From a paper:
During infection of mammalian hosts, African trypanosomes thwart immunity using antigenic variation of the dense Variant Surface Glycoprotein (VSG) coat, accessing a large repertoire of several thousand genes and pseudogenes, and switching to antigenically distinct copies. In the salivary glands of the fly, the pathogen adopts the metacyclic form and expresses a limited repertoire of VSG genes specific to that developmental stage. We present here three novel metacyclic form VSG N-terminal domain crystal structures (mVSG397, mVSG531, and mVSG1954) and show that they mirror closely in architecture, oligomerization, and surface diversity the known classes of bloodstream form VSGs. The VSG protein can be roughly divided into three functional units: the signal peptide for delivery to the cell surface (and which is cleaved during translocation), a large N-terminal domain (NTD) that forms the bulk of the molecule, and the smaller C-terminal domain (CTD) that is tethered to the NTD by a flexible linker that can often be removed by endogenous and exogenous proteases.
VSGs 397 and 531 fall within Class A by homology analysis, whereas VSG1954 is a member of Class B. More specifically, by using the classification system outlined in Cross et al., mVSG397 belongs to Class A1 (similar to VSG522, which shares 72% sequence identity with Trypanosoma brucei rhodesiense VSGsur (GenBank: ATI14856), whose unusual structure was recently determined), mVSG531 to Class A2 (the same as VSG1 and VSG2), and VSG1954 to Class B. The conservation extends to the location of the four cysteine disulfides bridges concentrated at the top-lobe of the monomer. As with VSG3, and in contrast to Class A VSGs, mVSG1954 behaves as a monomer in solution and crystallized as a monomer in the asymmetric unit of the crystal. The ability of mVSG1954 to exist as a monomer is further corroborated by SEC-MALS analysis (size exclusion chromatography coupled to multi-angle light scatting). Also, like VSG3, while a monomer in the asymmetric unit, the mVSG1954 NTD exists as a crystallographic trimer that is highly similar to that of VSG3. Altogether, these data argue that, diverging from the dimers of Class A VSGs, members of Class B may adopt a trimeric oligomeric state, at least in solution and crystals, and possibly on the membrane. In contrast to the structure of VSG3, the NTD of mVSG1954 does not show any evidence in the crystals of O-linked glycosylation, despite possessing a close consensus sequence to the motif shown previously to often contain this PTM. Using intact protein mass spectrometry, the absence of such a sugar on the conserved loop at S321 was confirmed (the residue predicted to be glycosylated from the consensus sequence), although a hexose residue was found on the full length protein, even after PNGase treatment. This additional hexose may be located on the highly glycosylated CTD or on a novel site in the NTD that was, nonetheless, not seen to be glycosylated in the crystals.
Residue numbers in the entry:
A (entry chain A), B (entry chain A), C (entry chain A): 24 to 90, 94 to 119, 123 to 130, 132 to 383
Write the structure that this text describes.
C-alpha cells in the first residue's frame, strides 16, 4: 500500500536544511587594498633609487615580459620583474616620488632595498593566503555534498544498474545502509521521497504535497532528475533560507545525527535511518507501506558511529572549516597590513637619510 | 471550543529560544591599552623635539581647545592638537623623555615625526573600528527582533485597528501570513499564546501553564502588554538561558525554520505556520479549537522561502554578524598593536640618532 | 511496571550529543615557527655585536644555567640568559652573521639592542598566549562536563549514600530537581537509563536496546560504572560523531534546553525534566511505569531559568569559549609575526649602519 502522505515530512525538513545551505549566498574573499598600495609605493621607491637609466628602461619596457641591451635585466630578474613593472607604472603616471628621484649612498640604497624587498614579501604572502582559492574549495564542498565528490547534477541523472529499491535505499539488515544512501544528499532524498513502483497518488506525497508528484519509480537505472528537481525545489518551503555559516552547518548536522540516530521500527531495530520503517522494518526500505518495509533511507551504522559517513557530512564539515578559514583570512590580512604599514612608515622616513 | 492546554507548547519553546537570546548577557567592546600608551609616548616624543617654547606653550594650554601669541598654533592644527594635548599631559607629569628633551637635526626631527604621525594614524584607525559602535548595533538588532525596527515595548502596546484575529494571525489562505505575524517576536507570541475571546480557562494555556492566565482577548486595538509580560516571562522556563553567540542564533533560526516549515493541518495545506491548525486549518488562525481554525501564527510563505521573512530573522542574523565582527575587532586591534609596537620600538632606537 | 522500551530514546539522543562532543577529536595549539626563527636571529645578532670575548664565553657556556670569571654575566642576566643561549646556538652552528661578527659605535650597538630586546618581547608575548594552556583547559571542561568538576570516571563509581531513586533523580516537587541531576552528564544518564530495582527486562531498554542490559538497580551507594560504560558507549549510535566546535556545543545546548523545557506529565506540571514522567509525575522520578512516577531526570527549575544549572552546561559553555580562544590564538600569533618581521627587516637593514 502507499505509505501515508506526510509520513516522511520531518525527515524531509531535516535533509532540506542541508540542501538549502548549498543554495545560500556565499561569502566574498577578503582583499587588502592597503597591501597593494604599499607594494606599489615600495616598488616605485625601489626602482626610483636605482638611477635614471634603469628607471627609463623599466618604464620603456613595463608592458614587456622579462623574456641584453635592456639595463633593467641587471637590476631585476624574472622573479622581481613584477616589482619593476608595478614601480614603472607609478613612475610613469609621479612628482610624489620626487624626494626619491635626491642622491643616496650604496649603503643607503642597500638598506632601502631591504625594506622594499620585505614589503614585496608581504604582498607575496598576502597572495598565498588564498592559494588554493578558498571560495572554490567552499563551492566544491557544497556541490560534493549534493551530488557526490566531483559530480554534478547531470552526472548523477540515473540510478545504478542491477540493484533493487531495497538494496539501494535500505537492506533487510538494519545496520548495513542502502548502497546509494549516504553518498549525496540528492540520492538520500530520492530514496526518501521518490515514487515506489506501485504508488497510486499518496505515497508520492510521503515527504511533501508535491506538485507535480514524483513520477519515476525508484528502481535500477531509473532516470530521476525531473523528480529530483521537484524534490529539491520544495526544500525552501520546509527548511527556509538558513545562512551559509559554520554555525548553521554544524547545527544542521547535529539535528540530522539525532534524527537519524533514534532507532526506528516497532521493535526499535532499524538503526541510523531516516524516513519511516513500516512495522518492524525487517523487510528493508522497499518504499511500500502496510507491512514491514517502508519508505526510508538507511545509513551505514558503523560509518555513522565513527564519523566517516555519510560522505556528505564530511563535505559539509569541510565547507564549515573553509568558512572559518575565510573569516580568518580577513584577520590574517589585517596582520599583514600591520607589517606593511610599519615598513612603509620606516621607508618613508628614510627619504631623508 | 478552547484549544487544548499545552497544544502550542513546542512552538512556544522554539520562539522562546529567540526571546531568551535577547535577554542574554552581552559582550564587551574590545579595547587596546597598548595602543593608547604607545600613542601617548609618541605624542610626548613628537612634542618634546619641537623645542622648549612649543613644549612650554602646549603644556600651558593643554586644557584649551585649538580655538596667535600661542606658538603651538604654528606646530599643530586643530587636527593634530589632540596629539599635543596627549603629549603635554605626559611632559607635565617626565624624566623618562629626558633623552628627547638632547639636540636633533631638522632631518632627524622630520624622520621622528614620520613615525609619530604613523603612530597617531594607528590610534585613529583603532578608534574607527567601532565607528559605528557595534555594541549599540547589537542591542538595536536584538530590540528590533522583539518589537519591530526602531520600536520599544511601550510603542507596541496595542494591536492594529480594523483587523480580526484571523486577518492578524493567519488568514484562510494557508500561504499568505497573518498581518501582524513575522514582524516581531512579541506579536508572533501574542498570536500563538494569547486569549481568544471565547476562551474559558483552557485555551489561555495553549502555550504554557501561565499564572496569571493571559486575560485580554486578541482582537483589533487590544491592549496586550500585560499579557506579553506574562508570556515573555515564561520563556526562561521552557528555553532556559542560551548564550548570546552567533552559534546560538543560527542554531535557533534553523530549528525555527524546520518547525514552522513542516506543513500542518489534517490535509497538510497550512504552510510556514507555528502553533496548531485545527482540523484542515482552512478557516485560518482564529484561536478557536474543535473545528477547522486553530490557535496558530502563520508566516508569509514566499518571504519565508526567499529568506526575506520573518523580519526578526533578518534582525537576528544581523545580531549574529555583529557578534562575529566584535570577535574580529579584538584580532584587528591585535594587528594594530603589532604596527604600533614595531613603530614604537623603531622610534625608541632613534633617541640615539 | 517496567517503563516501555524506547520511552526515553529522544532524551537519550539529546544528552548523547553532549557526550559525543567530549569524545570528539580536539584541536591543536597554534604555533609560530616564524617567531622562533626571528627570535633566534635577533638573539644571534644581539650577541654577535657584543664582541669576541662575550661571544666566545656565551658559546663556551651555552649549556650552563646563568647560576664571575664568565664575562657573559656582565652582558646578560638570568632574565636574558635564554637570549644568549639561543644566540650562542646559532653562532656555534654561522657565516650568515658575518656582517654582524664589522665594527659598530656604542650608539649603533644601543639601537641594535633596542630592536633585539623588542623581538625578545614578541617571543615572550607569543609564549604567554597559552599560559595557561588552553588545550588543557578545554580537556578539563569536557571532563568536568561528564563527571563533575575535577572528577574522573573512577572517582564517580558509586551513587551517594542515604538517598532514594526519587530523591536522587527527581523529587515529588516538580521544580526542585534530583539531588544527583544536573551535576554531570554521567549521573543524568544513569538516572535516565538505569535499571529500576523491579525492572524485568523492558525498563532497562527505556533509553536504547542495550546489550548487555543495565544490570545494577539505581539506589543509594549503587556501583554503576559497568552500566555507565554500556550507556555511554551507545551514544555514538544515536547521536553520531559531531565535531568539537563552539558551533556544535551551543547547538547541542539549545536543543537540550528546549527538550528539557517543554513541561511534562499529563497535567504539564513537571518542569525542566528529561525522560518521561508517568501519569501526572506527582510521585517523582521513581524509575517505575504505570502510575504517576516515571523514569525521568529532573533539573532544578530556578537554576535552569537563571543559566546557572545544569553545571555541565556551564562547563560546556567554557569549552566553547576556549575553542573560540584557540581560534583567536592563531590570529594573535599572526599579529605577533607581523611585529617580529617588521622588526627583523629593520634590524636586517642596520647591518649597514
Ligand atoms: C606609504 O608611505 C607613502 C610614503 O612613501 C605614503 O604615501 C605620501 O603621503 C603624503 C601624505 O601627506 C603625501 O603628501 C604623498 O604624496 C604620499 N605619497 C608618496 C609617494 O610619498 C602612503 O600614504 C603610505 N601608505 C600607503 C598605503 O602607501
Ligand atoms: C614604547 O616605547 C617607549 C620608549 O620610548 C617605552 O617606554 C621606556 O621603556 C623603559 C623600559 O626599560 C623605561 O626605562 C622607560 O622609562 C620607558 N619610557 C620611556 C618614555 O622611554 C614603552 O615601553 C614602549 N611601549 C609602549 C606601549 O609605550
Ligand atoms: C630575519 O632577518 C634575517 C636577516 O638578519 C633573515 O635571514 C638572511 O636572509 C638572506 C636571504 O636572501 C640570506 O642570504 C641570509 O643567509 C639570511 N640569514 C641571515 C642570518 O642573515 C631572515 O630571513 C628574516 N626572517 C626570519 C624569520 O628570520
Ligand atoms: Br495518507
Ligand atoms: Br552566491
Ligand atoms: Br626594488
Ligand atoms: Br602559487
Ligand atoms: Br528488524
Ligand atoms: Br553512511
Ligand atoms: Br486541555
Ligand atoms: Br548585558
Ligand atoms: Br607630533
Ligand atoms: Br567618526
Ligand atoms: Br486548508
Ligand atoms: Br513572514
Ligand atoms: Br515496551
Ligand atoms: Br583527540
Ligand atoms: Br642581546
Ligand atoms: Br608564565
Ligand atoms: Br505533578
Ligand atoms: Br540543575
Amino acid at each position: 500500500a502507499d505509505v501515508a502522505a506526510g509520513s516522511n515530512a520531518e525527515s524531509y525538513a531535516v535533509l532540506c536544511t542541508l540542501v538549502q545551505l548549498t543554495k545560500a549566498t556565499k561569502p566574498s574573499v577578503p582583499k587588502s587594498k592597503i597591501i597593494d598600495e604599499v607594494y606599489n609605493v615600495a616598488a616605485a621607491i625601489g626602482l626610483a633609487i636605482r638611477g635614471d637609466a634603469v628607471v627609463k628602461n623599466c618604464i620603456d619596457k613595463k608592458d614587456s615580459k622579462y623574456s641584453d641591451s635592456d639595463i633593467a635585466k641587471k637590476a631585476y630578474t624574472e622573479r622581481t620583474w613584477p616589482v619593476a613593472q608595478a614601480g614603472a607604472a607609478k613612475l610613469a603616471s609621479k612628482e610624489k616620488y620626487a624626494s626619491w628621484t635626491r642622491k643616496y649612498t650604496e649603503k643607503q640604497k642597500l638598506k632601502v632595498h631591504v625594506l622594499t624587498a620585505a614589503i614585496s614579501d608581504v604582498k607575496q604572502r598576502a597572495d598565498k593566503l588564498n592559494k588554493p582559492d578558498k571560495l572554490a574549495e567552499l563551492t566544491g564542498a557544497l556541490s560534493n555534498s549534493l551530488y557526490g565528490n566531483g559530480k554534478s547534477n547531470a552526472d548523477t541523472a540515473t540510478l545504478p544498474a542491477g540493484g533493487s529499491h531495497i538494496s539501494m535505499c535500505g537492506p533487510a539488515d538494519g545496520t548495513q545502509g542502502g548502497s546509494i544512501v549516504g553518498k549525496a544528499l540528492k540520492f538520500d532524498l530520492i530514496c526518501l521521497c521518490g515514487k515506489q513502483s506501485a504508488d497510486s497518488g499518496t505515497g508520492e506525497k510521503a515527504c511533501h504535497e508535491f506538485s507535480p508528484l514524483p513520477a519515476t519509480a525508484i528502481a535500477e537505472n531509473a532516470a530521476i532528475n525531473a523528480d529530483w528537481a521537484t524534490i529539491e525545489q520544495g526544500c525552501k518551503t520546509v527548511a527556509g533560507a538558513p545562512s551559509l555559516t559554520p554555525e548553521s552547518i554544524h547545527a544542521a548536522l547535529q539535528a540530522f545525527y539525532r534524527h537519524a540516530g533514534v532507532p526506528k521500527g516497532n521493535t526499535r531495530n532499524r538503526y541510523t535511518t531516516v524516513g519511516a520503517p513500516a512495522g518492524s522494518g525487517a523487510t528493508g526500505c522497499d518504499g511500500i507501506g502496510g507491512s514491514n518495509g517502508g519508505k526510508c533511507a538507511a545509513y551505514n551504522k558503523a560509518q555513522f558511529e565513527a564519523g566517516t559517513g555519510p560522505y556528505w557530512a564530511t563535505q559539509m564539515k569541510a565547507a564549515a572549516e573553509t568558512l572559518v578559514e575565510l573569516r580568518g583570512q580577513e584577520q590574517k590580512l589585517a596582520a599583514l597590513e600591520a607589517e606593511a604599514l610599519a615598513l612603509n612608515s620606516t621607508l618613508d622616513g628614510m627619504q631623508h637619510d
